[PDB]
Recover the amino acids of this structure.
């Protein structure tokens, strides 16, 4: 039932144990698929799919490869300088969440969020870096230094507003054959632990589905039983998913209940399991 | 700050005379540094594959640890995690 | 796409006082900055003007340089050109996520002086050390006169050179010719060149 | 400029197959360093880039024979192993701050030749003004002629009474080949010094033409009978004529 969205999410994990020990690791997601991997040990961004470069030429990919190499070295050098200036103690952990989403015909949406020790400190907005609603005093000082760099502001603007929506459309076109993949789930009913004395737990398992958009509801014929506990969509190594949907019901009201599964691979033929 | 959520499950339904994969989804933790290993009948599994370290929108991390196995009737499976938020390494028993 | 910087024209010989235009085109419009340089033979770049991506125009002295990213163009205008401007002018750009300058091949600009009172003449100059060795000096010719290289291999001719006697305001053009040949005469020295009809040759 | 980028050697003549090392001293505090290559009648072409001590862009490096260093984030050396005739060029070094407005050094002119016996210093001669010129224009032109030199690594200057002069001076923009149908041709360079007849007519006035040649060093091997063609100043002089 849910709409399949395809934003490009470029994630960066930078750890600083001491002034001497550091590593920068990253990856790229196109929706729920991982297209790229980036280790501190390698000098290039690793392609995971045969269609990961998109419609970009070898020359265009090399320019990005160059920007990421210069960025990592520069980023890892700037944090050490900032920690010395703003008197910030090690260990340090910085996270970057950059990317965009393409809306064919209409204007594209972009983002660049930076977190410090799991909390939002700043983000790129329009043509400059901007602090979070509530941000420590040392963030405003780091922003004063960061906003003085005309070149980085222009590189980030050009990467987000220009390069990124182009790259997304290229991936959507080069990987389309793999993006239309459908993997039918296996479903079954079970009785989970007793939640109360005169009550029982109904469990509906949906296993091995791809893509991730799914709909699972406990039903009384056609009446949607609000009180369905969907839980987390858990991952499988083969890129398929797992989901459990439970329902707390007092003994007797379990009769006439069913579980309705809606998924794209089912081609309209919903899985309906009666308890 | 953020304590890890541990969930142990298998790719396919459990069967005595059949090959399967033992998954362990560790999520909602912070910082990045985490210790994870799949235990079988007590001892740890040396050949245990894992996914590339990633994080959710709330900035908390997540990982999928997996290994090919056969659910033996006498072999009891679980997963052990050690983190900065934990006083002792947490052990979550796999429930079929 | 790899950046390609192009400059039109490759060479330009203009008379003193004229307002000249130097063109620069680039295929990649994602420009961080555009830098115009001056280079004298045979090495060393002199920074003239820098236009920033946001900027449309930059002025400094008789120089004005415009930038148009959308048309992938940059122009260097030189006002009231002087002989001193005579050099190779290079246009180069830095792209948005790049550091390196990508250069054009350059415009070889020659600004010839305005010779108000021409007195074309070819003089024989004897060496201070010995009477045997001598050179031929073609001088005081107007800038419309062009000195041609020698057809004979054993005769050497230089291109025209401009000197300014700042104390007297006087400007002068000259070319030197010499050979080791016995039949070499100063009268026959600039025979391959179209020298003025009123050229003076002393006995 | 006074406080700019320095490069050394300014001129280098190397034998084919020999190793050469080029030094660049950037502007103090400049985080960025760049190397460029400039072929004869061509625009400069990017070689390599340094941000502090890290060589973050080596795309322009032609082959394995070219290797650059900047270990302390200051001085950069560019080394060319087993040099060839195609390596003959001006190697330009530049430095900048974060704005990437590049300040260029004076460059290194590298000439790669077959044998070092090809190297010759110039012969310098001063040609005295013609009395016909003195009678006709009341102006007096001295001509200086530097001949038979190789490589094309000369700096000509005129000295009047122990002081260098620029007024009424014109040196050829580039030397001419004494045999244009040859790669290893020796060169000739001329310059003109023009003064008033009266200034030349004073026998107290001394006119000197100096040609600074850049040739062989103490480390270069020499086996020819003739004097080793080292870095030297070759001059010619003239005293004023009463007439
Ligand atoms: C994206 C679509 C393409 C698809 C590709 C496929 C995906 C690839 C796979 C995984 C991606 C991994 C995730 C990483 C996402 C980040 C996107 C790259 C953004 C590059 C910015 C370029 C500017 C730069 O590099 N800037 C550097 C260099 O600048 C210096 O050198 C230049 C010449 O090289 C110039 O002269 C310049 O003036 C000078 O400052 C800065 O140092 C910058 O400040 C680094 C940090 C930028 C982020 C700022 C946020 C950090 C705030 C932390 C502060 C708190 C620290 C406290 C301890
Ligand atoms: C740097 O951090 C690592 C973290 O594992 C540690 O092993 C190393 O000893 C630290 N070095 C210093 C100089 O503190
Ligand atoms: C990450 O890469 C940098 C590259 O300069 C290196 O210095 C650092 O030691 C690497 N980190 C680890 C953990 O190997």
């Amino acid at each position: 039932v849910p709409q399949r969205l395809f934003p490009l999410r470029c994630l960066q994990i930078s750890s600083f144990a001491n002034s001497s020990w550091t590593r920068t690791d990253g990856l790229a997601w196109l929706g729920e698929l991982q297209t790229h991997s980036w280790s501190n040990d390698s000098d290039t961004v690793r392609s995971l799919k045969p269609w990961s470069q998109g419609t970009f030429s070898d020359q265009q990919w090399e320019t990005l490869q160059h920007i990421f190499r210069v960025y990592r070295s520069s980023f890892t050098r700037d944090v050490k300088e900032f920690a010395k200036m703003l008197r910030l103690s090690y260990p340090l952990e910085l996270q970057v969440s950059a990317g965009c989403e393409v809306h064919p015909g209409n204007a594209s949406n972009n983002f660049f969020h930076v977190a410090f020790q799991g909390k939002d400190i700043l983000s790129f907005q329009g043509t400059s870096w901007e602090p979070t609603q509530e941000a420590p005093l040392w963030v405003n000082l780091a922003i004063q230094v960061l906003n003085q760099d005309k070149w980085t502001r222009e590189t980030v603007q050009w990467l987000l507003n220009g390069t990124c929506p182009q790259f997304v459309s290229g991936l959507l076109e080069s990987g389309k054959s793999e993006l239309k993949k459908q993997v039918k789930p296996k479903a079954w009913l079970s009785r989970g632990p007793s939640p109360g004395p005169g009550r029982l737990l109904l469990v509906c398992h949906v296993s091995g589905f791809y893509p991730k958009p799914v709909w699972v509801k406990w039903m009384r014929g056609e009446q949607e039983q609000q009180g369905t506990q969907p839980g987390d969509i858990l991952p499988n190594a083969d890129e398929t998913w797992y989901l459990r949907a439970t329902l707390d019901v007092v003994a007797g009201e379990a009769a006439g209940l069913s579980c309705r599964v809606k998924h794209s691979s089912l081609e309209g033929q919903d899985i309906v399991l009666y308890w | 700050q953020r304590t890890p959520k541990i969930q142990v499950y298998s790719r396919h339904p459990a069967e005595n005379g059949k090959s399967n994969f033992l998954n362990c989804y560790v999520s909602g933790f912070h910082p990045s540094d985490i210790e994870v290993d799949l235990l079988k009948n007590g001892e740890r599994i040396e050949k245990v594959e894992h996914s590339d370290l990633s994080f959710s929108k709330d900035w908390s991390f997540y990982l999928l640890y997996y290994t090919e196995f056969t659910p033996t009737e006498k072999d009891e499976y679980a997963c052990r995690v050690n983190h900065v938020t934990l006083s002792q390494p947490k052990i979550v028993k796999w429930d079929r | 796409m790899k950046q390609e910087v192009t400059q039109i024209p490759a060479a330009l010989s203009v008379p003193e006082g004229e307002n000249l235009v130097l063109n620069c085109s680039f295929t990649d419009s994602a420009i961080y900055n555009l830098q115009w340089f001056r280079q004298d033979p045979g090495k060393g770049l002199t920074s003239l003007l820098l236009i920033q991506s946001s900027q449309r125009e930059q002025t400094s002295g008789r120089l004005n340089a415009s930038l148009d990213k959308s048309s992938g163009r940059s122009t260097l205008y030189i006002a009231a050109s002087q002989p001193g401007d005579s050099a190779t002018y290079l246009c180069a750009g830095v792209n948005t996520g790049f550091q390196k300058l990508v250069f054009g091949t350059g415009t070889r600009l020659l600004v010839s002086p305005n010779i108000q009172n021409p007195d074309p003449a070819v003089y024989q100059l004897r060496d201070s050390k010995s009477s045997d060795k001598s050179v031929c000096l073609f001088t005081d010719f107007d800038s419309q006169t062009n000195v041609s290289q020698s057809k004979d291999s054993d005769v050497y001719i230089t291109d025209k050179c401009v000197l300014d006697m700042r104390s007297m305001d006087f400007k002068s053009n000259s070319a030197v010719a010499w050979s080791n040949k016995s039949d070499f005469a100063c009268a026959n020295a600039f025979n391959n060149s179209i020298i003025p009809e009123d050229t003076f040759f002393p006995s | 400029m006074g406080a700019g980028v320095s490069q050394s050697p300014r001129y280098k003549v190397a034998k084919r197959g020999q190793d050469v090392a080029l030094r660049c001293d950037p502007i103090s505090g400049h985080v960025s360093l760049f190397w460029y290559q400039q072929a004869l009648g061509q625009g400069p072409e990017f070689l390599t880039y340094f941000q502090n001590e890290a060589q973050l862009d080596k795309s322009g490096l032609p082959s394995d024979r070219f290797f650059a260093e900047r270990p302390e984030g200051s001085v950069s050396t560019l080394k060319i192993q087993r040099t060839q005739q195609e390596d003959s060029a001006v190697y330009l070094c530049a430095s900048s701050s974060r704005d990437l407005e590049q300040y260029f050094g004076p460059g290194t002119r590298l000439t790669v030749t077959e044998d070092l016996k090809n190297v010759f210093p110039p012969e310098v001669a001063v040609f005295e003004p013609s009395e016909a010129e003195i009678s006709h224009t009341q102006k007096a032109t001295l001509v200086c002629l530097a001949t038979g030199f190789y490589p094309d690594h000369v700096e000509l200057s005129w000295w009047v009474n122990g002081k260098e002069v620029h007024s009424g001076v014109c040196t050829d923009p580039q030397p001419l080949k004494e045999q244009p149908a040859l790669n290893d041709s020796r060169y000739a360079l001329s310059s003109r010094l023009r003064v008033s007849a009266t200034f030349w007519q004073n026998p107290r006035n001394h006119f000197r033409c100096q040609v600074q040649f850049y040739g062989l060093s103490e480390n270069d091997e020499w086996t020819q009978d003739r004097a080793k063609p080292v870095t030297q100043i070759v001059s010619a002089e003239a005293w004023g004529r009463a007439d």
